[PDB]
TrEMBL record, chain B:
Species of origin: Shewanella piezotolerans (strain WP3 / JCM 13877)
Protein name according to UniProt: Polyunsaturated fatty acid synthase PfaD
Binding site for FMN: A93, A95, N145, S174, K208, E256, G260, G299, G320, S321
Residues the entry annotates as binding Ca(2+): E256, H262
Domain Fatty acid synthase subunit PfaD N-terminal: 6-68
GO molecular function, one term: metal ion binding
Keyword Nucleotide-binding: yes
Length: 530, 533
């Protein structure tokens, strides 16, 4: 035995309730003893075998005082000014709302404002509110890649730069773009001491090794010289942009709610971590690149598994939409509280509909995925809305669109023409495009209906969620978290973090050969954390 | 206050990263970490208590400590004991002998459990496999795959009787949707009492499942009714029937997450806690003297994933994908070379030949073969149209020239001959159903693509159906730039030991990092910088 202590019999508890309370106490170490008869016992005080003296037992196992700060990368917590190696990911169209961002940031927890799909004045509005509530952070804003429209992306970056938004979650990118590189380089300088200052921080969320590679390596000299080209960056921005990675943190996004490649967390995260060590050994950054991970994290066990694999931080998404601070309707959050792991499925995505791309959504309690998948089948099979069989089309019009396809198209032409005339000119004299735009009316609005609580459209709510939500609901069954109105994002974050810490301590004891009562092997939500 | 009551003498500290790596890799000894004000993080393997043997010297206090713990600290020691193996690990079955006799024998010779891939093999071929494996491993360890035959109960029964005749004492039961009389017969026929100690379970069963119901059925004892039926056959005895109700139908349950081959794509991190919670329920109910165990595979291709799986509570880990790429596997040189460069995103889902019409899928390689594209096109056409005659002429002629290399009518004629000889009901059922006819025609391609890849059919390489999941891509990225880049140097025992010793190494490094030590970054992960076997 490596443990040089003895435990007095009066300091041991063989009571499983007392033992759980000792294991839950991260401020003190635990000493485990084996009584041939009363079984496993735990104490919090021990003496050296020579310092104090029979009726003493030798320490069979030990685990020291360690809490949530022992999980993940301390440099993440330092760089982002957060109390936990954790962030709540963006949720589109304000689902990761100002209320959610402010509630989490006030508790010291990073959260990403869901700017995707929101108009610029709405986003500036969120910037002002969040910065007024959190003058020193923490928070970040989602920059979603706009492949069709680089100007929108550039405007979002310029809004962030104007207001000194210092942290961006960059997602849906397939590589670098001038806009994100601009945001990155505009924040680079040096102090009077040679230390280089990275003021604009970037968390790049990726699921593909090549995209991760682009964000782990510095911005390419060519793109930076074309930014020195205009009125965008400085000769102090380029020299330094080539000595720092394009991102401080890489989020490996496994199988998730919403847009996803449905990649296993146990295969995606090791791949990105191996790439991280390759690139970090090559470039020898003074502050190393970090890799965190989300997608499937709904329970303390999944969180601990993610940390144990090497993640610098964990990311949650699906469980946060179910909390009262999220910008989801009352009906939607109620529905989410009973969604099981098999109650999600893949359905066509509005913004990549014609390319066959899908996203993960709730399928129980809503007909959205069935109707959206039917739209994709009709789109691919037929050359035009006029080629759709009459029965199918009148089913569409009366139950899905609640209007004729012609009237949907008329509204689409009016809307686009008076906003983005390129979209309607482009579909002019092309029935495939026309049909795709008509169907995207439904694909686009179903999300909004769920977010706003549009009455009478419940059967059509598009609700992004992955199996992490069902995992959460199963783990929380029989607790106060069964009530959707009792779900708070800060409380959820703390359950995941403190539960992972508890499981980590228990695993250390099990690893040392101790057989704990089954009442100590897991963290049940029998008490509120916040 | 620091919990470590030792100090470390200066001559026992190393700040050399190579030596520190050797120390962390040495699981027979503990590691004491110190912070030297000037030289930084250092490691020693011996420390002394502040009194005992030290005096005021150049000694430093222990900033962190981790004890001597290796691979035996991973998983369930009862798994290792019951199956007679050195590691809580097994290489899962790979159909049509891909998990070959040589693979089983290499792994079992190293003390590692492997499952012979009997699926799709005729009885004389399986008997030849039994002969070889038992000649090389007269006392084990090994097991054989019993795949559920829903269509054919007689074949499952024949495989069970072959296993019983030859005293095959361990079966991996897979693709089951519940109990069958055959698996129950295998389990109960191995039951007795030593009449002086306690009940003896000689025929061991590892049930690989993805659903809770089936898992529950194998965690619970065989149902009395099922045991009572055939008690009239003389297959088992009344003392075997009565003992069968005191033991679970399986000693081990493999929770199969998203995997190569047949899969429903369940996340490991959500499936495994579910099956473990069910296990603890059932074990609290029945209080078996030897507890039921739950292990896990599907996505385990790297040591970090192995460790995470163990730390969620898995009794053992299961690998598949990475084993097909090794030299002992019964895969062709073309396939093993292709697999050594298959990346994480080079796999995809394609229709399964069995339950094709039900939309059921399996995970396959898409780089180096057009099979998944062509098979998914077959499923799309099948679901869209009511008959082969409804397919547009240009699409049908493309199919016939590029996929079947034959008209669909000629495929149908050969199909009629084939099933007349082997299962005529399948043609009879198609008589008044053109949809069924089309499904049978498309299943020609779904079946033969597998046969072509397994046998190495020349000229059909672009149609090879090759089962693999992203665990292979994870392995390949983790092994990039190492000796494992060469497919000719990939050995299954070596892979297993990298997973097991890497998981133990990472567990130790995680403990030290959690305690606040900042180790040199080269030491934070287990990289294949060394051959293990
Ligand atoms: C309803 C919902 C909306 C989301 N919207 C966005 C988004 O707009 N931009 C983005 O980068 N990620 C978005 N995500 C992804 C999350 O930020 C997070 O990465 C992911 O949900 C974590 O996986 P999980 O769902 O299994 O928890 C969204 C997720 C959900 C559930
Ligand atoms: C090519 C291949 C063939 C397989 N054949 C079988 C089989 O015949 N029977 C079975 O039970 N499992 C079979 N499996 C599943 C493996 O035994 C194992 O459960 C699975 O591969 C583990 O998941 P992984 O691929 O992510 O490692 C096969 C897997 C592969 C890759
Ligand atoms: Ca997403
Ligand atoms: Ca399988």
């Amino acid at each position: 035995s490596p443990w040089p202590w003895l435990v007095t019999d009066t300091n041991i508890s063989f009571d499983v309730t007392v033992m759980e309370q000792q294991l839950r106490d991260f401020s003190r170490g635990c000493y485990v003893v084996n009584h041939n008869e009363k079984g496993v016992g735990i104490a919090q005080t021990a003496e050296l075998v020579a310092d104090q003296a029979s009726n003493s037992l030798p320490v069979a196992a030990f685990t020291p005082a360690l809490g949530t700060e022992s999980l993940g990368d301390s440099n993440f917590r330092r760089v982002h000014g957060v109390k936990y190696a954790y962030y709540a990911g963006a949720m589109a169209n304000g689902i990761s709302s100002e209320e959610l961002v402010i509630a989490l940031g006030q508790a010291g927890i990073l959260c990403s404002f869901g700017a995707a799909g929101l108009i610029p004045s709405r986003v500036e509005k969120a910037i002002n509110r969040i910065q007024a509530a959190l003058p020193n952070g923490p928070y970040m804003f989602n920059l979603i890649h706009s492949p069709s429209e680089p100007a929108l992306e550039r405007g979002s970056v310029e809004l962030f730069l104007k207001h000194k938004v210092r942290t961006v979650e960059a997602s849906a990118f397939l590589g670098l773009t001038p806009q994100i590189v601009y945001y990155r380089a505009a924040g680079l300088s040096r102090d009077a001491q040679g230390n280089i200052v990275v003021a604009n921080k970037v968390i790049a969320k990726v699921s593909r090794t090549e995209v991760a590679e682009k964000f782990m390596m510095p911005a390419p000299a060519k793109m930076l010289q074309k930014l020195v080209d205009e009125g965008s960056i400085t000769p102090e921005q380029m020299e330094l942009a080539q000595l720092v990675p394009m991102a401080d943190d890489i989020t490996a996004e496994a199988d998730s709610g919403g847009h996803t490649d449905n990649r296993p967390l146990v295969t995606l995260l090791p791949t990105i971590l191996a790439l991280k060590e390759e690139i970090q050994t090559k470039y020898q950054y003074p502050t190393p690149i970090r890799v965190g991970c989300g997608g499937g994290v709904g329970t303390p066990d999944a969180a601990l598994a993610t940390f144990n694999m090497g993640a610098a931080y964990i990311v949650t998404g699906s469980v946060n939409q179910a909390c009262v601070e999220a910008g989801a309707s009352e009906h939607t959050r109620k529905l989410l509280s009973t969604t099981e792991m098999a109650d999600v499925t893949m359905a066509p995505a509005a913004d990549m509909f014609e390319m066959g791309v899908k996203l993960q959504v709730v399928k129980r309690g809503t007909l959205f995925p069935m109707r959206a998948n039917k739209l994709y089948e009709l789109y691919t099979r037929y050359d035009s809305i006029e080629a759709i069989p009459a029965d199918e089309r009148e089913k569409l019009e009366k139950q899905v669109f609640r209007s004729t396809l012609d009237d949907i198209w008329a509204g689409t032409v009016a809307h686009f023409n008076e906003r983005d005339p390129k979209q309607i000119e482009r579909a002019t004299d092309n029935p495939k495009r026309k049909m795709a735009l008509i169907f995207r009316w439904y694909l686009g609005l179903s999300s909004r209906w769920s977010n706003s609580g549009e009455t009478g459209r419940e059967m059509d709510y598009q609700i992004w969620a992955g199996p992490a939500l069902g995992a959460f609901n199963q783990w929380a069954k029989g607790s106060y978290l069964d009530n959707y109105q009792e779900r708070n994002a800060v409380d959820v974050a703390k359950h995941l973090m403190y539960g992972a810490a508890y499981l980590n301590r228990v695993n250390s004891l099990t690893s040392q050969g101790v057989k704990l009562p089954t009442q100590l092997l897991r963290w049940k939500p029998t008490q509120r954390m916040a």
